[PDB]
Every structure is written in structure tokens, then in C-alpha cells.
Write a protein that binds this ligand. Structure first.
Ligand SMILES: OC[C@H]1O[C@@H](OC[C@H]2O[C@@H](O)[C@H](O)[C@@H](O)[C@H]2O)[C@H](O)[C@@H](O)[C@H]1O
Length: 410
């Protein structure tokens, strides 16, 4: 009797894929973007608490899945997924499993890449294809800002996910969980990758080379990408779909290169990457699962790549529509040549191959990333050393873990 489901998600391809699902099945998909990352999670937490108003399906990033799964908020879908290890790439598949059970299906992955506005870089005297090391990026940042006081190599108003990703990139692993999830060590204040990232970003902050006012996912963020005042992004491989749909005016001016690394070594991290989960509260579990399967495993997979997301599955990596992609279909189906003809998935596939293994999320990343700004904000809007904020963040996370029943060590 189910003729409609409710979905919360911000991935820009989901509107098209949901419309395609409606055409195929006759099931109405009531899709809402209720906020990006932590803004969505606040709303999901509120609906979970209230016992009412949750969607049947939500977009939940890999880093957030442990907290939701451990608390019993996601439906165990293990019995639907027999052959899925063979379908999905290993990182995404590992990330949807908590304590032996599958709680979501991967929909995209976020190996990082350096997206840059070639027009702005060239005008500033920077070769965006020659940014191999973090020092190269620092030197580029000075040249970009020399264009004028409003021009910055990128923006960072104080984002936890970026901090965590750059720690990973630099070889760090400040979070460890063992013993079926009961024993957690946090050593942000000692981890060498954290230290290396802090030293790098602290210099750019100190020299006022970053836009610390613009908040990610706001309109001014996309305006900056259009007008050149946010000249580049060190971010996940999902960015193309967002550039195409939300920064269309700069189409043709941007390019993709591999992430710069601390010393030019081959290394990468992931930033973001998402799954779709059925909420445990859903009275429409079968229809919710059927929708997720279409998006994440069936014909939605190809649509997702063609509309600018990076795949979570093995076959897409070998598919012609991935490897030989140049133009990206926007939300209206029009082919947009955002990267000026670049075979951008040649770079993104290499970016994925370069990701360092072994990194782990905390079992409470929704909490951890939600409070990052409480401890670190003054490092981005003020003079507080990053290292001081990180120490205060670690103490808060240890205390929270203990209060929630984890055995916490440093
Ligand atoms: O296409 C949208 C993608 O959105 C990503 O989520 C946003 C991203 O924001 C960053 O500022 C942050 O550092 C990072 O941790 C993420 O929260 C999703 O991760 C991605 O899968 C796409 O849906």
C-alpha cells in the first residue's frame, strides 16, 4: 500500500535520481535538503529524540554512520547485501558496517583533489598544475591574495571535516576504536599528522591568507567560486556536481589536480563521502530500502556519476562513462563542460588510488565535529593557536566518551 516515502539528503544528484525512480515505479519520493552535514544531523537528532518526524531515508556520511548505528537509529539491512562486498569499493563497503552489520548503502566516495580556478591562478602568476607540496600551496596562497584584499586561495571558517581529512593526508590517525567499539583512544595532541597540518594551516591563518568569513555550503561560498575570490578548493571528489549546479558562472575556468602533500610524497585522504540509510523508525522499511537500492546499486549509480559524483562501486571505475567523462550533466540534464574539456576522472581515479589506509572515525563523530567550532573557532576568527584549540577539543571528546559509556584513553 506504500505509495510515498520521505528522504532527507543534500547530494545534488538525488533530485534527478529520485525523479527517475518515481517514473520507473510510481512511488512518490518526497525529497528534502534540510541542510548539509551537521545541519542535517541536528534535524535527524531532533526527530529521533522526539520519536516523530524522521524521514524514512537519510543521507548519512561515512564518518557519521558509527554514531547513528551504535545508538540503534539505523535499520540493519545486512540480509539484503549478500554480494555487495563484490560490488562496492573496499573503503565505502567497510564504512557501512558496524559490529558485523550493514546499516546503509554507499552512494559516493570522497578521495580528495585540488580543484582550482585556472583563470585566477594564471592571472596571479601561479601554475595550478605545479602545486605538489604544502609549501607550494603556501607560496601560491600569497600570490593569490596579492591580487587584492578580497581574493583568497580558498576559504575555511573552521571546518572539522577538513581538519580531520588533512590530518589523514599527513599520515595521522588520532582516533582508535577496538573491543566491539567499547575502547577508544584519542591522541590529537600527540599525533604527527595533526601536528604537521597545524603547522601548515597556522601559517596561512597567521598571514591572513585564508578567507575565514565565508562558511562552506553557503551562497557566498558558491559566489566566491564564481567571482574568483575563492580561487580553489582542497576537497572531496564529489565537488564537480556542486560546481556545475551551484557555481555555474565559472564553468570552463576550473581544473582538477592531485592534492598537494606535506613533502610531495604520494598520499591522499578522503573528505566526505556518503551512504543512504533506512531509519530504524521507518514504518516503510521495504519501500525505503527499495529506493536506496536503486540509487546506490541499481541504475541510479550511472546517473550519479554522469551528474558529477565520484563512484562507490568497482565497475564504475572501469566504465567508459567514468573514465572518459569530460562534461557533467546538471540538474536539468544539460551537459556542462565545467573543466574546459579535462578528463577529470583520470585525476580523480588516481586520487582514489593514492588514499592512505588505516584511518578511523570516532564512534561519535556527529558530536565531535559538531563541537569542533566551540574549541577551534577562535583559531579561525581570532588569534588562538590551532594547537591550543585542539587540546581543548581532545579533552572535551575524552570526557564525552566516558560519559557515554566508552572506556577512553589518550
Ligand atoms: O555533493 C555533496 C557532497 O557533500 C559532502 O558533505 C559535505 C562535506 O563538507 C565539507 O565542508 C566537509 O569537510 C566534509 O566532511 C563533508 O561534510 C558529502 O560528504 C558528499 O558525500 C556529497 O554528498
Amino acid at each position: 500500500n506504500v505509495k510515498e516515502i520521505d528522504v532527507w539528503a543534500w547530494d545534488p544528484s538525488l533530485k534527478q535520481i529520485a525523479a527517475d525512480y518515481e517514473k520507473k515505479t510510481g512511488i512518490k519520493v518526497n525529497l528534502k535538503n534540510v541542510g548539509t552535514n551537521t545541519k542535517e544531523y541536528t534535524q535527524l537528532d531532533n526527530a529521533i529524540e522526539a520519536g516523530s518526524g524522521a524521514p524514512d531515508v537519510a543521507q548519512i556520511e561515512y564518518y557519521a554512520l558509527p554514531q547513528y548505528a551504535i545508538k540503534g537509529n539505523l535499520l540493519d539491512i545486512t540480509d539484503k547485501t549478500s554480494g555487495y562486498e563484490d560490488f562496492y569499493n573496499p573503503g565505502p563497503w567497510s564504512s557501512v558496517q558496524i559490529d558485523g552489520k550493514v546499516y546503509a548503502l554507499p552512494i559516493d566516495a570522497g578521495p580528495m583533489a585540488f580543484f582550482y580556478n585556472k583563470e585566477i591562478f594564471d592571472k596571479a602568476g601561479v601554475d595550478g598544475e605545479k602545486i605538489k607540496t604544502w609549501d607550494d600551496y603556501y607560496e601560491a596562497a600569497k600570490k593569490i591574495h596579492a591580487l587584492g584584499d578580497e581574493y583568497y586561495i580558498t576559504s575555511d571558517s573552521g571546518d572539522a571535516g577538513f581538519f580531520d581529512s588533512m590530518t589523514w593526508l599527513a599520515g595521522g590517525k588520532p582516533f582508535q576504536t577496538t573491543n566491539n567499539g567499547k575502547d577508544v583512544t584519542i591522541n590529537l595532541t600527540g599525533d604527527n599528522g595533526v601536528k604537521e597540518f597545524e603547522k601548515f594551516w597556522q601559517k596561512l591563518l597567521d598571514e591572513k591568507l585564508l578567507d575565514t568569513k565565508t562558511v562552506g555550503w553557503s551562497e557566498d561560498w558558491f559566489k566566491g567560486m564564481q567571482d574568483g575570490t575563492i580561487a580553489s578548493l582542497l576537497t572531496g571528489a564529489w565537488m564537480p556536481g556542486n560546481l556545475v549546479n551551484s557555481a555555474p558562472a565559472a564553468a570552463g575556468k576550473w581544473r582538477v589536480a592531485l592534492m598537494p602533500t606535506p613533502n610531495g610524497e604520494k598520499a591522499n585522504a578522503e573528505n566526505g563521502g556518503s551512504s543512504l540509510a533506512v531509519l530504524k523508525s521507518s514504518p516503510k522499511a521495504q519501500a525505503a530500502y527499495d529506493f536506496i537500492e536503486y540509487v546506490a546499486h541499481g541504475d541510479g549509480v550511472k546517473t550519479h556519476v554522469e551528474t558529477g559524483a565520484f563512484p562507490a562501486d568497482k565497475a564504475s571505475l572501469e566504465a567508459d562513462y567514468f573514465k572518459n567523462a569530460t562534461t557533467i550533466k546538471n540538474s536539468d540534464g544539460k551537459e556542462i563542460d565545467y573543466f574546459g574539456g579535462q578528463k577529470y576522472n583520470e585525476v580523480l581515479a588516481q586520487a582514489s588510488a593514492d588514499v592512505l589506509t588505516g584511518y578511523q572515525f570516532l564512534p561519535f563523530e556527529v558530536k565531535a565535529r559538531g563541537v569542533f567550532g566551540d574549541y577551534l573557532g577562535k583559531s579561525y576568527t581570532g588569534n588562538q593557536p590551532l594547537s591550543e584549540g585542539v587540546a581543548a577539543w581532545q579533552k572535551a571528546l575524552i570526557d564525552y566518551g566516558k560519559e557515554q559509556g566508552f572506556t577512553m584513553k589518550e
